[PDB]
Design a protein around this nucleic acid. Structure first.
Ligand SMILES: [Mg+2]
Ligand SMILES: [Mg+2]
Lengths: 107, 95, 133, 52, 57, 325
RNA sequence: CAGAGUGUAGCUUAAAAGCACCCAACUUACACUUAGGAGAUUCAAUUGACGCUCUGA
RNA sequence: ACCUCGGAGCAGAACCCAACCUCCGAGCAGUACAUGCUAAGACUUCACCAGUCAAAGCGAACCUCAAUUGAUCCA
């Protein structure tokens, strides 16, 4: 016997060049098929979401793990002396500027 | 992405008396490190007597000879069997 | 006569107002990139650099024993450098920093000394929040 | 193994919350937030409420 | 005591200074040997190959 | 479909035949450094930056160092705070100029004031605004000082043996941008003293509008080979003082090169109002800071699984409306 | 003792740098980290004259 | 023999995809006791129900874990 689990419907919900508002989920995954980049967050599922209004872009950026997170550090240590890991990152490149000074009155 | 020219950019898996004796062992280890040889392991084996080990693998005859000479140049040695003298030490090889 | 939108285009304007956007993410990668300015200390053999950086990567302010004015007259050296930087910061008007060291670095005495020096100078190593709404 | 228990605040009375604890061990006392009082306050265990 | 500590630090420094020189000397010696070996192999190659091969074994 | 890489892939050269011979970064610091270096480098795959971004002297120095060491003998180290003023002075003398460029770049003076093109402020300019008796509030390059403290014109020194001292606000207040407001204009100066040199435009204080942000004034100093004419009375009319330094630099400053800079931050204060009223003769403009409104999607007919808050997001506004009864 | 290549501390499309290296402490030891340590343009006005490497006698 | 839930293959590269197809497992633990209030904006196991993520704000500091669960009325 065994289990028949339903499809999980995970993956990218927003592709490069899409206009993504603050809060929109960008990509859902188990493990990191993509990582959070500029203005992109991570939920408890590892799901990536936009932190600002703007455009999604994908990039392959050098990956440095946090010192406190042990396993990654170990892996890094293991690598040979000219090696760099690299990983894919999702950014939102913000469109509308946060601020505009308007004239209230002439006092 | 697979079909993109940046395919395997993330790929990483493919890249990955007693006191005196102790001191001597340490020195030997250091020397090994310097000369670029695999130091596998070291032991703390049991008047009194005390033994120390420095397990080594892979070294060419000339280089090996040089290493031996340096080691020679106290206590004792034991690895052809190459013993010498000035607790105990035993640098077991695997050339 | 006055326009509706006066556009003050001072680069550091929205930083001092505490309104400009910090880069929020990079929650896997280190160090976090959410800061207006970052105190990057770079130690080597011989000389110890200290910097003040933006999101852009532009080094605004610095202090090092390579710069030869402070090579005249090590933990002490580091402290001195920090002090110098603090003075520099004051002149520039960078009174706020983020300092995100490795744990070992944080533990270290030299770093602590540097921090102390900075504090003395009058430069906080925390930096205020973005202020939304 | 684990019991469900109700915990009653001394200050800010009426507010009760449900928590876990091992069946073998001590009656539970805990600092926790009362939104009535709007301060942290000691709760004390009182009556187990199902076991599991 | 303070004086003793001061003395001790100095002594340590001296020791450190000594050790590095010795290390350097050792390295130099090693290098010399290596050079000799390099020379020797070449010479062997030039002269008679069988002998060289034997030496290598 | 397998496309080949456009340029060379990373991690190609270092894998090699064997892995057990290499050095590996046993530390993290080294790895971090490497990563940083990589980041600094360009690459072909977009990437972050695409989307977002004497001998004698030396000998002397060495000797001095040696002397210092001897003096120490070290013991002190085994806790000496060092004189800071001296260090500062040294910096000013030597690499201060070098430093200044970076700050200027950061602050966008070269891009706005000079339309591009960087230059080193070689000659050290030392301005200070008098506040009572002492201390004189010094205008270090980058500093925040209030327009109350900047109500009267400052004292200036530089220790240089002719000059033209200028002072301009870079933002372009009130009227349309790509404009600047000069605050004074000192000309044909002999040596260190302001009183000896001529003045075309006299000193106004800074006058930054309320809640307009922070403004960046800039003192400029140039080298005079030849004495030159310039161009308007003790005036407080605003349409005269609107002038951009780029054009000026171009169509005139040809026997001239800028050698001294200092920039200075400004905010609202109680003197600003006075300035607006007394001499400028107009109502002061109030500047808030308005953010763009909250988004919300389109109004859906049957919201479905949203809360009862759905309807509060689309409403003008709050009070209870009574249609027709 | 005649020629050629030259000649920044171990080493560099460094320009007094960064990598290497040494001592102590943590380490069985190594490793990491933290404190410290030491080092250089061979010398006189691009030219000449001292030091190596190499080839002759 | 099985009947609910989850992970891997079939299903090699956005999701989705069966069989009394092939293989692993779950029906819990552990740490907390601000596992406090609320709230823009999204995802969703192809319906609905159930699930999920979550900026800001107000309160405070200075969650781990794959599955680890069950409607209504009634008590
Ligand atoms: Mg659905
Ligand atoms: Mg929050």
């Amino acid at each position: 016997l065994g289990g028949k689990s339903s499809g999980r419907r995970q993956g990218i919900k927003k592709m490069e060049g899409h206009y993504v508002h603050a809060g929109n989920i960008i990509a859902t995954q188990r493990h990191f098929r993509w990582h959070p980049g500029a203005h992109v967050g991570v939920g408890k599922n590892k799901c990536l979401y936009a932190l600002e209004e703007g455009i999604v872009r994908y990039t392959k950026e050098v990956y440095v793990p946090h010192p406190r997170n042990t396993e990654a550090v170990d892996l890094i240590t293991r690598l040979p002396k000219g090696a760099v890991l690299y990983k894919t990152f999702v950014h939102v490149v913000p469109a509308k500027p946060e601020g505009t000074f308007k004239l209230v009155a002439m006092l | 992405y697979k079909t993109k020219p940046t395919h395997g950019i993330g790929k990483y898996k493919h890249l990955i008396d007693m006191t005196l004796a102790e001191s001597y062992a340490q020195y030997v280890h250091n020397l090994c490190n310097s000369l670029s040889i695999k130091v596998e392991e070291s032991y703390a084996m049991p008047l009194t007597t005390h033994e120390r080990v420095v397990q080594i693998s892979g070294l060419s005859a000339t280089f090996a000879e040089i290493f031996l000479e340096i080691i020679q140049s106290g206590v004792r040695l034991s690895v052809x069997x190459x013993x010498x003298x000035x607790x105990x030490x035993x640098x077991x090889x695997x050339x | 006569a006055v326009a509706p939108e006066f556009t003050n285009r001072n680069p550091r304007n929205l930083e001092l107002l505490s309104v400009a956007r910090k880069e929020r993410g990079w929650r896997t990668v280190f160090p976090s990139r959410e800061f207006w300015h970052r105190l990057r200390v770079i130690r080597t053999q011989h000389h110890v650099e200290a910097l003040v950086e933006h999101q852009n990567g532009k080094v605004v302010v610095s202090a090092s024993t390579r710069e030869w004015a402070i090579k005249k007259h090590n933990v002490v050296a580091c402290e001195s450098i920090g002090r110098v930087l603090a003075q520099r910061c004051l002149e520039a008007g960078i009174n706020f920093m983020v300092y995100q060291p490795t744990p070992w670095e944080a533990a270290s005495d030299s770093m602590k000394r540097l921090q102390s020096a900075m504090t003395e100078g009058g430069v906080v190593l925390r930096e205020p929040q973005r202020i939304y709404e | 193994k684990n019991i469900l228990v109700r915990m009653v605040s001394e200050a800010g009375t009426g507010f009760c919350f449900n928590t876990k604890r091992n069946r073998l061990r001590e009656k539970l006392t805990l600092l926790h937030y009362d939104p009535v009082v709007k301060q942290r306050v000691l709760f004390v265990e009182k009556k187990k409420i199902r076991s599991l | 005591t303070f004086e003793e500590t001061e003395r001790r630090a100095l002594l340590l420094k001296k020791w450190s200074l000594y050790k590095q020189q010795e290390r350097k000397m050792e390295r130099d010696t090693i290098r010399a040997m290596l050079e000799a070996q390099q020379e020797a192999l070449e010479e062997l190659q030039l002269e008679s190959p069988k002998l060289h091969a034997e030496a290598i074994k | 479909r397998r496309t080949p890489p456009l340029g060379p892939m990373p991690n190609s050269d270092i894998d090699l035949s064997n892995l057990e011979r290499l050095e590996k970064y046993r530390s993290f610091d080294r790895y971090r450094r490497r990563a940083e270096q990589e980041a600094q480098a360009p690459h072909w795959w977009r990437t972050y930056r695409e989307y977002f971004g004497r001998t004698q002297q030396l000998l002397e120095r060495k000797q001095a160092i040696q002397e210092l060491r001897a003096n120490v003998e070290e013991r002190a180290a085994r806790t000496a705070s060092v004189p800071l003023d001296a260090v500062r002075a040294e910096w000013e003398r030597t690499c201060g100029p070098y430093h200044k460029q970076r700050l200027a770049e950061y602050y966008g003076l070269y891009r706005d004031l000079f339309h591009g093109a960087t230059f080193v402020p070689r000659v050290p300019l030392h301005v200070a605004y008098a506040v009572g008796e002492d201390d004189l509030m010094p205008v270090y390059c980058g500093n925040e000082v209030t327009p109350t403290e900047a109500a009267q014109a400052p004292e200036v020194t530089y220790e240089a043996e002719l000059w033209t001292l200028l002072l301009t606000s870079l933002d372009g207040h009130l009227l349309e941008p790509d404009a600047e407001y000069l605050h004074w204009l000192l000309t044909n100066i002999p040596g260190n003293r302001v009183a000896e040199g001529q003045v075309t435009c006299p000193y106004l204080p800074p006058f930054p509008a309320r809640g307009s942000g922070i403004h960046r004034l800039a003192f400029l100093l140039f080298k005079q080979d030849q004495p030159i004419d310039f161009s308007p009375s003790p005036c407080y009319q605003l349409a005269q003082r609107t002038f951009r330094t780029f054009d000026f630099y171009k169509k005139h400053q040809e026997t001239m090169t800028p050698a001294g800079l200092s920039f200075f931050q400004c905010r609202w204060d109680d003197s600003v109002t006075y300035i607006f009223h007394q001499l400028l003769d107009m109502r002061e403009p109030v500047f808030e800071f308005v953010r763009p409104p909250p988004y919300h999607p389109k109004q859906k007919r049957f919201p479905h699984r949203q809360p009862l808050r759905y309807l509060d997001r689309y409403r003008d506004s709050h009070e209870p409306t009574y249609g027709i009864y």
